Design a protein around this ligand. Sequence first.
Ligand SMILES: Cc1cc2nc3c(=O)[nH]c(=O)nc-3n(C[C@H](O)[C@H](O)[C@H](O)COP(=O)(O)OP(=O)(O)OC[C@H]3O[C@@H](n4cnc5c(N)ncnc54)[C@H](O)[C@@H]3O)c2cc1C
Length: 296
Amino acid sequence: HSKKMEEGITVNKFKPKTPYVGRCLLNTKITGDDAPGETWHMVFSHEGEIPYREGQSVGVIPDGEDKNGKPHKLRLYSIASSALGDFGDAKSVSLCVKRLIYTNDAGETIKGVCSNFLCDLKPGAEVKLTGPVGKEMLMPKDPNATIIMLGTGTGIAPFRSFLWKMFFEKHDDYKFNGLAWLFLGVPTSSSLLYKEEFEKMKEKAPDNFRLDFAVSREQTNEKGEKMYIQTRMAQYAVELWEMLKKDNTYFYMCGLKGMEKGIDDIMVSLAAAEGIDWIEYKRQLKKAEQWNVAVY
Ligand SMILES: Cc1cc2nc3c(=O)[nH]c(=O)nc-3n(C[C@H](O)[C@H](O)[C@H](O)COP(=O)(O)OP(=O)(O)OC[C@H]3O[C@@H](n4cnc5c(N)ncnc54)[C@H](O)[C@@H]3O)c2cc1C
């Protein structure tokens, strides 16, 4: 029995040994120059060969071989477009990718393999894709569900997928009528991803969509604390905690592994205040399919 849209999903139609080869249509840098690090939105053609659903991921096998002459390991990217896609025809797939650049022990600059390959793609270049992968981040079946979404950085990707479906499309069997609430935590204003799209959805369904941004390096709460995502949530603590108590509420979290801890800290306190052990409560939520997490 699922509370999620699991029926008839496709998983691993394409595999590492037999990937689907698509072509890049567009590749755009979507963060401003200020932004610490670039993030690119890219669209690939798949001609309807990859029957994905909102919340799933695709694997990307970057070109080249590892130090042993073997093909690079695949990396997973949450799909950032809804099932019909950015063009409404179910033939393209979009990804949201941050370019990874760090320094090794010797002070030498290392670029992540897959992220730099993807961000460097030019229209017309081919790309090896696997999947779809995943069941954890699918949408609830309930069209009247209260859906709370908390992403950091690229974790915004599956929520864009959800929201395009909910608010930018007409479906014969699905009309969203609940409350969708998005919190997005980034470091700078030049790093707010898809703000413009979310701003248009808000105007469209003002009673069905709430939006909150947390720009850490540019916002502080009263104590003077940095505006991290949990720092922004705490401000709605009483409201969110009350929302968590209802059977039709669904929590999804996606982004950097770090975020998990700072929300747990906020939650352990709200629950204890009511005589509840957060660890056991979160466990029950996870089992009821209401606390969904994908951090990396
Ligand atoms: C379910 C899922 C969905 C994902 N969705 C997305 C998405 O939508 N967008 C996205 O950008 N990524 C996403 N990722 C992450 C993505 O899969 C890649 O890991 C990421 O793009 C970097 O891979 P790479 O090949 O560029 O790096 P690699 O070449 O594999 O390099 C990674 C390695 O770099 C090292 N490293 C990183 N930072 C440092 C540092 N500061 N100092 C030292 N060593 C360091 C780590 O040891 C790590 O093993 C997702 C991951 C998962 C599991």
